[PDB]
Amino acid sequence: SKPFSLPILTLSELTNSRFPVPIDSLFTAQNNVLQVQCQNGRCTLDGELQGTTQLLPSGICAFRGRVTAETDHRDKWHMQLQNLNGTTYDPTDDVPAPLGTPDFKGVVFGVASQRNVGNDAPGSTRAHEAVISTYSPQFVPKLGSVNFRSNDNDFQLQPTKFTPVGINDDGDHPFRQWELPDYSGLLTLNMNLAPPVAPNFPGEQLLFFRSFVPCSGGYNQGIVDCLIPQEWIQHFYQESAPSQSDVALIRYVNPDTGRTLFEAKLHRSGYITVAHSGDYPLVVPANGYFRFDSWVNQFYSLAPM
Amino acid sequence: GPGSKPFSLPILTLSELTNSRFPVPIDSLFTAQNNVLQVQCQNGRCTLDGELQGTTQLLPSGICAFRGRVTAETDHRDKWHMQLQNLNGTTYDPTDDVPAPLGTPDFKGVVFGVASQRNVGNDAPGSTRAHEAVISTYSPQFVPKLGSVNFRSNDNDFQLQPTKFTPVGINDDGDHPFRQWELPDYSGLLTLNMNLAPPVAPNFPGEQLLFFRSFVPCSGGYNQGIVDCLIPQEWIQHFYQESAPSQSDVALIRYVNPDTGRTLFEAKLHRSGYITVAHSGDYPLVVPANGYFRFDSWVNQFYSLAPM
């Protein structure tokens, strides 16, 4: 059978799978009652994509479609969604939302761009700053549309792309990276979600690949934690190696010295735990990377780090 | 002989591929009739056994991005002077054998996007701002090899603080045309570019370059946003991981429809990391949505491709 493996990539060679920026650091968080259930950056070790996860970093928190109405909501521009590859989005599909849809509560700011097709000035373009709030009642991507705000009113009912740049609070409504938006809007339930993940033992904590993304004013730190980086997801999808157990053993190695620095559990659902107690931002050598050593199980006792 | 790791391509459809010269998906395949223009792009350059070249790095998020600090507000058209770090935040060294910091744009024109800041130090640390910004590679202040570029903004809410530029699209620079095959002057006016990945061209009669084409966003006007890359970013990432030894200068690759099993056409994947096909004239390909290239065998410079 095809052997499981990790790609060989340093921290600065990795992309955040929940926002299209490089990984900045590794962080392990103290356990709490709040649920970790992100929908982007979800993939099993044998390469099954889950939630709203797709392969491209350019897909993450991006939208593609057409503006089909200009309204007088604060979120003025009504954007009917396609799939990111331009095919027609089907709301009855067994996904939470179109692949790449944001999986947090707050705003994503960026640029909405257009290129005309059809009889009305085909090939004419425009691009302006735009904001999408996932708190908005018009944020209904599962149903097939989202609305965006712009200070500019130079927009047409034409094919549209949204490129994310950063995140922020939505005025008084805080940026909450672990709170899912209501993909179908108010008074509806989310469906087809990737499951929540948690340590099976109190001495273990989730380990995150952490990014500090851009913010558009205020003092928000722009913290976006992902379970596994986008490149691991891409790698597992290509490889499709069969998982021999529920838990893979991985070691963080310094190639400069050859030393193993610490070990971790890489679970079959696609997340990592370490033996540690408390919030801890790791300090690791620049050339360090995770190495897959063996299939183990839940009853492996991780060396404390 | 000893064994060697087999060469391969990742299995990805066109819409599962990223342009290696601008951070957007591939839209189509295009083969161009030979013409007066020279192809010497610096992004999206990698050998088949995984050696990155030019200004090529691994992250799509790296492509046409900048990281550094705004160290001055000037009187240039490109007002804000941005001293560069490497994209991973380490200090940039102008004496390194690269054309410019990795990820630097490799075309003449404008990249528009957003410049963002987060303060450190004594002055309101942790405060942020982000605004539309434009960087022109025609600019005399575009001197990334020397360690800086300048950007424009209609907004003047910028500070001398850690700064990132996130690219969104391209355009012409006013009267100066967007030229994807013209390199910027990385060290500025009246200086020479160095350490470049080499020019690329068909060496065999009846053959043309095949491009992975994207139509990227533009910020007004009718520019088509056409950015062609020699190989998509995932192929580069794949070769970098695999490091499979090249058995030849030319790999024979075939475009396959997995639904039917049918081979649609064949192409030469040259060791330098570009593709040629047997065709005469400009030709926008029509291919099935599920199609992808498959590596079949190593051949040589005198292999004769079936016409497509």
Phi, psi of A259 (to 5 degrees): -65, 140
Mark whether B16 and B48 lie in a shared domain.
yes
- Identify the bridge partners of residue B265 per DSSP, sorted by sequence position: B255
CA of B106: how far to CAs of B18, B78, B235, in Å? 17, 19, 19
One-letter amino acid at A50 equals Q
Report the b/e string of A11-34 with b at 16+ CB within 10 A: bbbbbbbbbbbbbbebbbbebeee
Output the domain CATH number for residue A187: 2.40.510.10
Experimental method: X-ray
Are A212 and A24 in contact by the 8 Å Cβ rule? The answer is: yes
Backbone angles phi, psi at A222, to 5 degrees: 65, 35
β-pair partners for A170: A173
Query: In angstroms, what CA-CA distances link B253 with B8, B81, B115?
Result: 10, 46, 41
> Which pair of tokens denotes residue B81?
């002077």
Chain B residues inside the 8 Å CB shell of A5: none
Residues 6+ apart with CB under 8 A from B3: none
Tell which residue, B203, B38, B207, B161, has the closest CA to residue B107.
Answer: B38
Regarding whether B124 and B67 lie in a shared domain, the answer is yes
Angle in degrees, CA A173, A179, A184, rounded to 5: 90
Residues of B in contact with A124 (CB under 8 A): 221-222
User: Cβ contact (<8 Å) for A57 and B59?
Assistant: yes
- DSSP annotation of A86 reads S
Cα A85 to Cα A131: distance, rounded to the nearest angstrom: 22
Pairing of strands B162-171, B66-73: antiparallel
d(CA B212, CA B284): 11
Report, in angstroms and rounded to the nearest whole number, the Rg of chain B calculated over CA atoms.
21
- Contact of B236 with B46, CB cutoff 8 Å: yes
A187 and A267 within one domain: yes
The tally of domains found in chain A comes to: 2
B114 contacts in chain A (CB < 8 Å): 110-111, 129, 165-166, 214
Q: What is the identity of the amino acid at B116?
A: S
Output the CA angle B37-B42-B45, nearest 5 degrees: 105
What residues in B contact A22, CB-CB < 8 Å? 59, 61-62, 87-88
| A212 part of contact set with chain B, CB < 8 Å | yes
Same domain as B159, residue B15: no
State both tokens at A289. 């990377």
Using CB atoms, which residue from B10, B18, B126 is nearest to A56? B18
Q: How many CB atoms lie within 10 A of CB A258?
A: 7
The single-letter DSSP state of residue A193 is P
Other beta carbons within 10 angstroms of residue A80's beta carbon come to 15
Q: Is B107 exposed, middle or buried (0-12, 13-18, 19+ CB in 10 A)?
A: buried
Tokens of A233: 């997801």
Q: Per the CB < 8 Å rule, is A110 touching B168?
A: yes
Which residues on adjacent β-strands are paired with residue A81? A65
Q: At what angle do helices A230-239 and B233-242 cross, to 10 degrees?
A: 70
**Strand residue runs (E) in B159-291:** 162-171, 207-215, 226-229, 250-256, 263-270, 274-278, 283-284
Residues 135-194 (A) with a CB less than 8 A from some CB of B: 161, 163, 165-166
Residue B198 to residues A131, A287, B243, B274, Cα–Cα distance (Å):
42, 29, 21, 12
CB-based contact, A62 to chain B, within 8 Å: no
**Nearest C-alpha of chain B: how many angstroms from A271?**
22
What residues contact B75, with CB distance under 8 A and at least 6 apart? none
Q: Which residues of A touch B131 (CB under 8 A)?
A: 129
Final residue before a domain boundary, out of A168, A195, A228: A168
* Residues spanned by the domain of A82: 60-168
Using an 8 Å Cβ cutoff, are B291 and B47 in contact? no
Strand spans (E) along chain B: 28-31, 66-73, 80-85, 110-118, 128-136, 148-151, 162-171, 207-215, 226-229, 250-256, 263-270, 274-278, 283-284, 292-299
**Alpha-carbon separation of residue B71 from A91, B68, B146, B150, B231 (angstroms):** 49, 9, 14, 10, 36
When CB atoms are compared, the residue of A15, A129, A238 closest to B132 is: A129
Of A108, A133, A168, which residue constitutes the final position of a domain? A168
> Are B127 and A86 an interchain contact pair (Cβ–Cβ within 8 Å)?
no
DSSP category for residue B302: T
The verdict on B137 and B39 lying in the same domain is no
Q: What six digits make up the tokens of B3?
A: 């064994």
Q: What is the CATH number of the domain that holds B125?
A: 2.40.30.120
- Which amino acid is located at B33 in the chain? Q
Same domain, residue pair B32 and B181? yes
DSSP code of residue B46:
B
Q: Are A164 and A108 in contact (CB under 8 A)?
A: yes
CA distances from B105 to B40, B235, B299 (A): 13, 19, 34
Q: B248: closest CA among B294, B303, B169?
A: B303
Resolution limit, Å: 2.3
| Neighbouring-strand partners of residue A187 | none
CA R_g for chain A? 20
Smallest CA-to-CA distance from A215 within A90, A131, A98 is with: A131
Size of interface A-B (CB pairs under 8 A): 138
Distances (CA, A) of A114 to A64, A117, A120: 10, 10, 13
Count the Cβ atoms, other than its own, within 10 Å of residue B299.
18
Residues 258 to 277 of B: which have CB under 8 A from any A CB?
A: none
Sign of the C-alpha dihedral computed for residues A54, A59, A61 and A62 taken in this order: negative
Structure tokens at A48: 């099954």
Is A231 within 8 Å of chain B by CB? yes
Per the CB < 8 A criterion, the answer to whether B229 and B197 are in contact is no
B52 and B77 inside one domain: no
Q: Which helix (H) or strand (E) holds A233?
A: helix A230-239
**A23 min Cα distance to partner chain B (Å):** 9
Shared domain check, B270 and B141: no
Among chain B residues, CA nearest to A240: B11
B51 and B163 belong to one structural domain: no
Q: Which helix (H) or strand (E) holds A239?
A: helix A230-239
Q: Which residue has the tokens 């691991």?
A: A232
Euclidean distance between CA atoms B202 and A185, whole angstroms: 55
Instruction: Tell me which residue of A213, A24, A163 sits closest to B132, measured CA to CA.
Output: A163
Neighbour count for residue A94 (Cβ, 10 Å): 7
Residue-wise burial string across A39-62, b where 16 or more C-beta atoms lie within 10 A, e elsewhere? bbbbbbbbbbbbbbbbbbbbbbbb
CB atoms within 10 A of CB B141: 20
Residue B242: which region, alpha, beta or left (left: phi > 0; alpha: psi -120 to 50)? alpha
Contacts within 8 Å (CB) and 24+ apart, A82-91: A84/A54, A84/A56, A84/A59, A84/B15, A84/B25, A85/B15, A85/B25, A85/B289, A86/B15, A87/B289, A89/A65, A89/A144, A91/A142, A91/A143, A91/A144
Whether A250 and A213 share a structural domain: yes
Tell me the one-letter amino acid at B29: L
CA distance A273 to A207: 5
A158 and A198 fall within a common domain = no
- Cα(B30)–Cα(A107) distance, integer angstroms: 38
- Whether residues A198 and A51 share a domain: the answer is yes
Q: Mark yes or no for CB contact A127/B166 under 8 Å.
A: no
Tell me which of A168, A196, A220 is where a domain ends: A168
Under DSSP, the state recorded for B49 is T
Best probe of the B interface among A10, A12, A287, by most B CBs < 10 A, is: A12
Pick left, alpha or beta for residue A248 (phi over 0 → left; psi -120 to 50 → alpha; otherwise beta). beta
Interface of A with B in 121-140 (CB under 8 A): 123-129
